[PDB]
Design a protein around this ligand. Sequence first.
Ligand SMILES: [Mg+2]
Ligand SMILES: [Mg+2]
Ligand SMILES: [Mg+2]
Ligand SMILES: [Mg+2]
Ligand SMILES: [Mg+2]
Ligand SMILES: [Mg+2]
Ligand SMILES: [Mg+2]
Ligand SMILES: [Mg+2]
Ligand SMILES: [Mg+2]
Ligand SMILES: [Mg+2]
Ligand SMILES: [Mg+2]
Ligand SMILES: [Mg+2]
Ligand SMILES: [Mg+2]
Ligand SMILES: [Mg+2]
Ligand SMILES: [Mg+2]
Ligand SMILES: [Mg+2]
Ligand SMILES: [Mg+2]
Ligand SMILES: [Mg+2]
Ligand SMILES: [Mg+2]
Ligand SMILES: [Mg+2]
Ligand SMILES: [Mg+2]
Ligand SMILES: [Mg+2]
Ligand SMILES: [Mg+2]
Ligand SMILES: [Mg+2]
Ligand SMILES: [Mg+2]
Ligand SMILES: [Mg+2]
Ligand SMILES: [Mg+2]
Ligand SMILES: [Mg+2]
Ligand SMILES: [Mg+2]
Ligand SMILES: [Mg+2]
Ligand SMILES: [Mg+2]
Ligand SMILES: [Mg+2]
Ligand SMILES: [Mg+2]
Ligand SMILES: [Mg+2]
Ligand SMILES: [Mg+2]
Ligand SMILES: [Mg+2]
Ligand SMILES: [Mg+2]
Ligand SMILES: [Mg+2]
Ligand SMILES: [Mg+2]
Ligand SMILES: [Mg+2]
Ligand SMILES: [Mg+2]
Ligand SMILES: [Mg+2]
Ligand SMILES: [Mg+2]
Ligand SMILES: [Mg+2]
Ligand SMILES: [Mg+2]
Ligand SMILES: [Mg+2]
Ligand SMILES: [Mg+2]
Ligand SMILES: [Mg+2]
Ligand SMILES: [Mg+2]
Ligand SMILES: [Mg+2]
Ligand SMILES: [Mg+2]
Ligand SMILES: [Mg+2]
Ligand SMILES: [Mg+2]
Ligand SMILES: [Mg+2]
Ligand SMILES: [Mg+2]
Ligand SMILES: [Mg+2]
Ligand SMILES: [Mg+2]
Ligand SMILES: [Mg+2]
Ligand SMILES: [Mg+2]
Ligand SMILES: [Mg+2]
Ligand SMILES: [Mg+2]
Lengths: 158, 134, 263
Amino acid sequence: APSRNGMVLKPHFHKDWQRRVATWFNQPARKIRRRKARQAKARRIAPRPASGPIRPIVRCPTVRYHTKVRAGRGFSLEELRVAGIHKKVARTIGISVDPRRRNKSTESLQANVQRLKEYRSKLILFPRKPSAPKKGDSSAEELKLATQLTGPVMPVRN
Amino acid sequence: MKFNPFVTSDRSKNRKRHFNAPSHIRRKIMSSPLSKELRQKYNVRSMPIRKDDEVQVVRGHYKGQQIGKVVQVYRKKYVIYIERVQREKANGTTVHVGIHPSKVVITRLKLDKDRKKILERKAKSRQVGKEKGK
Amino acid sequence: VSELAGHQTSAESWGTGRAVARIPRVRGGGTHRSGQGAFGNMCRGGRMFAPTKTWRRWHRRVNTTQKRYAICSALAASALPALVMSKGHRIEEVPELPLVVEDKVEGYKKTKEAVLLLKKLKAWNDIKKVYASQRMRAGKGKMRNRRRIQRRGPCIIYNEDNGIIKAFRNIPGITLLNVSKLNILKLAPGGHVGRFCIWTESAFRKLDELYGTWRKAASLKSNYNLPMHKMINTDLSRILKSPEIQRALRAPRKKIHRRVLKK
RNA sequence: CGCGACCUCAGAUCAGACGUGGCGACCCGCUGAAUUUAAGCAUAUUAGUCAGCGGAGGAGAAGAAACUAACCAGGAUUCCCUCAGUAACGGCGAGUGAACAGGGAAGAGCCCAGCGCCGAAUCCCCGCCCCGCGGCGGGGCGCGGGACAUGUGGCGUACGGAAGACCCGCUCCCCGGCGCCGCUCGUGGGGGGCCCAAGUCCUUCUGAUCGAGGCCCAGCCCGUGGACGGUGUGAGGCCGGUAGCGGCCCCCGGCGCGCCGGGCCCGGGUCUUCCCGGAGUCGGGUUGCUUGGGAAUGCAGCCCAAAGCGGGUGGUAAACUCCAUCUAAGGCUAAAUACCGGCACGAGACCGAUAGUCAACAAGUACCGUAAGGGAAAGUUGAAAAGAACUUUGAAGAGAGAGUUCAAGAGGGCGUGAAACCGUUAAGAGGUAAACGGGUGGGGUCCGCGCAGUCCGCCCGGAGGAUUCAACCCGGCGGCGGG
RNA sequence: CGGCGACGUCGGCUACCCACCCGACCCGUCUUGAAACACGGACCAAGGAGUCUAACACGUGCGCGAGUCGGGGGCUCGCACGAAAGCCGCCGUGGCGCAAUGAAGGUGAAGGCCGGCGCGCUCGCCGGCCGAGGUGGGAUCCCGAGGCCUCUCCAGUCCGCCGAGGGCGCACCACCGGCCCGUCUCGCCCGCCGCGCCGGGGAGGUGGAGCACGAGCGCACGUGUUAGGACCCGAAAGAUGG
RNA sequence: CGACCUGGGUAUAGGGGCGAAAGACUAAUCGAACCAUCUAGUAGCUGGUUCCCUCCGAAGUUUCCCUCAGGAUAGCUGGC
RNA sequence: CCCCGCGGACGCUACGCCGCGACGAGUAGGAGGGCCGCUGCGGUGAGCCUUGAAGCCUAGGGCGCGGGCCCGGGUGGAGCCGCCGCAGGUGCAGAUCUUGGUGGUAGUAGCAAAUAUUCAAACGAGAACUUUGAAGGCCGAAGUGGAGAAGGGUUCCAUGU
RNA sequence: CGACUCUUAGCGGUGGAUCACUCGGCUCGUGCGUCGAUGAAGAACGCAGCUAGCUGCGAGAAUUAAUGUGAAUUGCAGGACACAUUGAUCAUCGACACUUCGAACGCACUUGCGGCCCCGGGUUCCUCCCGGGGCUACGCCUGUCUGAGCGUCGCU
Ligand SMILES: [Mg+2]
Ligand SMILES: [Mg+2]
Ligand SMILES: [Mg+2]
Ligand SMILES: [Mg+2]
Ligand SMILES: [Mg+2]
Ligand SMILES: [Mg+2]
Ligand SMILES: [Mg+2]
Ligand SMILES: [Mg+2]
Ligand SMILES: [Mg+2]
Ligand SMILES: [Mg+2]
Ligand SMILES: [Mg+2]
Ligand SMILES: [Mg+2]
Ligand SMILES: [Mg+2]
Ligand SMILES: [Mg+2]
Ligand SMILES: [Mg+2]
Ligand SMILES: [Mg+2]
Ligand SMILES: [Mg+2]
Ligand SMILES: [Mg+2]
Ligand SMILES: [Mg+2]
Ligand SMILES: [Mg+2]
Ligand SMILES: [Mg+2]
Ligand SMILES: [Mg+2]
Ligand SMILES: [Mg+2]
Ligand SMILES: [Mg+2]
Ligand SMILES: [Mg+2]
Ligand SMILES: [Mg+2]
Ligand SMILES: [Mg+2]
Ligand SMILES: [Mg+2]
Ligand SMILES: [Mg+2]
Ligand SMILES: [Mg+2]
Ligand SMILES: [Mg+2]
Ligand SMILES: [Mg+2]
Ligand SMILES: [Mg+2]
Ligand SMILES: [Mg+2]
Ligand SMILES: [Mg+2]
Ligand SMILES: [Mg+2]
Ligand SMILES: [Mg+2]
Ligand SMILES: [Mg+2]
Ligand SMILES: [Mg+2]
Ligand SMILES: [Mg+2]
Ligand SMILES: [Mg+2]
Ligand SMILES: [Mg+2]
Ligand SMILES: [Mg+2]
Ligand SMILES: [Mg+2]
Ligand SMILES: [Mg+2]
Ligand SMILES: [Mg+2]
Ligand SMILES: [Mg+2]
Ligand SMILES: [Mg+2]
Ligand SMILES: [Mg+2]
Ligand SMILES: [Mg+2]
Ligand SMILES: [Mg+2]
Ligand SMILES: [Mg+2]
Ligand SMILES: [Mg+2]
Ligand SMILES: [Mg+2]
Ligand SMILES: [Mg+2]
Ligand SMILES: [Mg+2]
Ligand SMILES: [Mg+2]
Ligand SMILES: [Mg+2]
Ligand SMILES: [Mg+2]
Ligand SMILES: [Mg+2]
Ligand SMILES: [Mg+2]
């Protein structure tokens, strides 16, 4: 029975919720496990960026957020085409590709392709055979200047 | 203090392990300090107890400089029996008194092939530790 | 408690026409357990009233500004000899209460030289008090691995760890604390401020970056300035005896008028 | 009216394999209530929940859009925060109730059928020989058999592809071995085994000491070790252990290099010519369940049943009209995620033997029921058995002496040993049941250093003592004030 | 001021027994009413009942304040304590609040005085200022005639206290207006790249959980209500599988 | 001497069986067995509800309810 | 302008101390304080303890209105507590409460279905119940006889206590 | 004077509360995350010098071998064991072995009864008996062999 003034409340506890309760006591252990896996993966891929491949510059969909820009899933096929990168080589050199994304505005297209050119100018390519380099990069360029990068690759700034 | 995350400090767990310890490590548990002369002759401090070595009791009712040879290492009771460390019961006969080996000092070691090898390993490890410390 | 406790039984009530209480009783026969009560908080073997459960909200979240406020208050309190002596930290021959030493102690490796440092800083009586206070805890904590208890010694605060942790850490009561990761649970031991602290010089210099002055803000924190006072001059006796107050008062009425007998 | 081929079938203790059953905490596919709430009760709710059945793995399921959106667009799945107790559903009552976008964790993409092209290039099995055994592999040979044109393999899949030309770049793969590293990297990677500091120093308590004092030298000694347990109390130094980018031994595994052996085969750009897709499926009608999905979200039964500038979606049924979006009816895929069962561990502001698991103990035991099933109680001598020798009465139980022990007023269900109840001893009393409150009196058991009652500041006098007072000098230290 | 003080007595009663006088029915519970011929209770020991979570509301304590909050993630020798603590800041996404109103399309909170003009037509163009109006109370604060002093006055010097009256008026209250949104009644103007079935504006009632110079957010504690086993024990029943 | 008594072997199972019919019997249980679970089922109904002192201190009345052994609401109360 | 005197009581944990006036019933219920009590944690007491901790007993001495507490004596043999905060599975006479133990009843009811025993002796510490013998009786062949099925599972048979 | 009863104390009984102890739980967290026709889970029956339970084990039966360790095990007995012409004990466990049911597998079981193929003995190799060994379940894949069809054909 209600008594005097007060909100009319509808608690959703009519359904035996005690059997399904998620307790978060393993939250710090989960954080440590995630951190350890992060460190192990970064250790495994030594010169490559730890965070992952470069993601494209992408505008947010709806009218609430379209003024804002975030990171996308991968660079579009057209962006790769006009950047001069084969779509089967971009992923190996560390570029996320999003085949199912089409471009609608040349402004966003140009932003992404300038990003791709900038990444290609920032890339250090180890030769496949360490003894015999074909066209990769310079010995002085990679003897010490190639080191692991933390955080997003060329981060997106509003 | 203790930092190994795989080594317990629980009193109950430690007592369970101690009282349920297998015989081959009950031997290690039943270890006794060497005398000063033995601790000088060999660069080792303690030594697990054996059937036929001669000790002297340092604590309890039977203290004294008398050198008595062990005659029994009763590992289930975690005691040893010594030659003249005995006690006479009511009917006239006599038995031995259980004594924890930690309450005696070994004065002479029953040397054979194995004891010398154990002494060698312990002395080598002590030398390694002190030379790292220097 | 185990959610199954007190309920692993098929007991049902006997009824009402059998001259016994209506609490559920275990079925079956041929044993002591059959017919005994069950399922009640009053019954031997029944589950407790309101079995405590793991979803009890053990953790509390405190405002970050309040946490920094507490750290500032503890740091300020450690600098008052009345408060630290009130904690009983044996600071009698300490040359100066905000005790700061050179960074050479950060390079200490041996407990021998750490102890010699304490002895030359006249803090060894604190450790002696800790040694004299080691004893056995009263109660079930002995069964629950908290067998031995002792007092809190001084707190060593360091900027860079160059083995100073290993040099210390075999001294009972010594708590080693990085200056950029200060802990209120160690600065105020039992909820009462005033713990004796020994600062390395680099850690002492870093305090104006960690918590800032009032003229500047803290730089090593994104946004924090030191809390403001609500009372600058706290010397109440001096204030009351100031002439400006004394001229505005009326004279004291110091004659006690007791009850007068009605003759 | 026999002999062959094919098709469709059958048998076999045929040659060689595979499945079954268990666990089931987590997961997947079904089936599926009622108690309860609505203050009644039938829709609703409990709930797609319990119970029931089937199938797995270390995770499972999902998953690379027949998507979300309507934007200046995003872009597989899964999980967390939020959206949100919202949109919506609902005897529009009780109640129920998501999704998008945003931020994070993790991030990985792909393969067939078809359309075509390539002398079936394809695969299995059986023999012989060689190199390997480690999960049976490779090489070679067989006018050895078989599968297969009712279609094996190569290219190739919606991100367009292929074939020709023209141009540009030769750019370097995998697998299995030999030897060697840095060996592996928060400091060997893992597993196993054996070791590593310092008081039993002096005096003392005790039954025993691990207790209490002491150790001048800056301080008994070690301390990268003062966690823990054991030892006759309560131990950093008696012992095991503890700390340590400590030592040694054995075994096991992936990483690079030089060699060897095998398999291995052309990539990109421009132009021309071709080629492009999954059907009793979509969709519609109806029915029943389900959903927040409301003129019908999804699932399924039945009836109808397609198209190719087509189809699906665009959260109000319909016609016309433009636009946006994806490409259904085939398949694979790690990570983030779950885990009350299993193996091995660590910890606790939890419980301390009527508690905590039913189970600290010969506990799923004893025992009960035909059975499905139900299911207890039950810890503690002592440091050491030193577990009471021996004498003595009784037939023995059981006593009385004696003996052990610090203790048997710890003597085998033996730590301490409460209350209810009882026996005995002592005191007191008793014909209105006991017991109770208020007030005294008597008695008794104890308490009071009870038994000649204080003390202590100044002054007076007597008898005595004295590193002797004040005032000055020297030195030290404070407190206050000084334009 | 007196008496009495050690193996006999002095003082002590909460505490032990006994006696006597007065009073005095057995507790709990339901109940208008229990000592009740009402129910439970033979005795004793141990266990034994408003707990936790979630959601609100209000009061209070704390921090910051038109902001506040890292709770999820991440970064820091990973781990005795530490599963803690600290940091992020282009991690503030987001939540709550800083705006309301209508079903919705939508719309969305500044006035006051002093002037010249039209007609100061109940009004359009400005200017100058100020910046939420006015009334009546309103703690507090401010001014203040007039007094209160000494061994005394003829003459002013420094400051204190009392004070009739006067003023500014905090919060808050009662009212009168003003502005925002919805909806009625009336009537006239304005705008223009789309002259429109376009858009904007006024006056007068009336509906709103509004505005009218913010008060919230986070954490903690208490009380109350509800969902949950829900203060503890209790059905007759229902369903599933054996 | 019969529609007789009786052993053993079988068959029928719970909203079912079986009944020369009493709702009788179905393992001492039958107007729906027993076992375990949903389940700590629900109860406006009965019983109980654990330390001391100090201060304040009631109502059995209005209105509405498938309301009459109950609630909401006003009143009475305390606290801030 | 103090000084032959250099001196002059207590106080005020301000969350404290002191003064004056009025008042004191109380169920259900509400609120305040608790140096009331229990258990565990963080601090603190150079706390207590084998020259004796907890516990329990007491015709011992007291304190508080009370919750309760302190101390003395005894037993016991190993841990315990004060103060400041923190957190509760925190206080029992009831619940035909649960578990365990114990009383009165009470040396009471009762050891009364189916006719029945007696004498001597043996062993034996001990004989109404054993054994032997002598009597007297019952079952009376549809038995109190001799064997089996089902069920029981060693009860069968010696010897000893 | 006693008996009985009541109250209080001392002591002794009954009882097992309290207090202390704890090889037990409960809760959380981590790392793995592994059964079975090559016979699982479960059950039954057995195995010790003296052994009923608990535990361990399978007729090699409270265990064999191997490796590590290095003088015991222990309630009593007995007995090895130069501990190097090699070793008690315990641990690890990779070799060996692992009775009867049980998915349970020749058929069936509250019992029992077969069939095929080798080997050994009586036989004196031929087929009767006894003993030993190996097969003898269902479904299903690929292949093999034997086949059926007035199924569709071809030659005759
Ligand atoms: Mg990431
Ligand atoms: Mg329990
Ligand atoms: Mg205690
Ligand atoms: Mg075969
Ligand atoms: Mg209902
Ligand atoms: Mg109801
Ligand atoms: Mg009903
Ligand atoms: Mg329904
Ligand atoms: Mg289920
Ligand atoms: Mg299965
Ligand atoms: Mg999968
Ligand atoms: Mg899949
Ligand atoms: Mg639902
Ligand atoms: Mg093909
Ligand atoms: Mg696709
Ligand atoms: Mg110890
Ligand atoms: Mg120790
Ligand atoms: Mg040592
Ligand atoms: Mg180590
Ligand atoms: Mg007990
Ligand atoms: Mg128990
Ligand atoms: Mg007898
Ligand atoms: Mg004793
Ligand atoms: Mg006892
Ligand atoms: Mg008595
Ligand atoms: Mg009443
Ligand atoms: Mg009545
Ligand atoms: Mg009454
Ligand atoms: Mg009456
Ligand atoms: Mg009656
Ligand atoms: Mg009643
Ligand atoms: Mg009664
Ligand atoms: Mg009772
Ligand atoms: Mg943290
Ligand atoms: Mg925002
Ligand atoms: Mg909200
Ligand atoms: Mg006003
Ligand atoms: Mg208004
Ligand atoms: Mg309320
Ligand atoms: Mg009838
Ligand atoms: Mg019956
Ligand atoms: Mg209940
Ligand atoms: Mg019930
Ligand atoms: Mg009605
Ligand atoms: Mg009633
Ligand atoms: Mg009065
Ligand atoms: Mg009163
Ligand atoms: Mg309780
Ligand atoms: Mg009681
Ligand atoms: Mg109690
Ligand atoms: Mg009561
Ligand atoms: Mg009688
Ligand atoms: Mg009789
Ligand atoms: Mg006769
Ligand atoms: Mg006769
Ligand atoms: Mg017979
Ligand atoms: Mg017999
Ligand atoms: Mg007694
Ligand atoms: Mg062996
Ligand atoms: Mg048969
Ligand atoms: Mg034919």
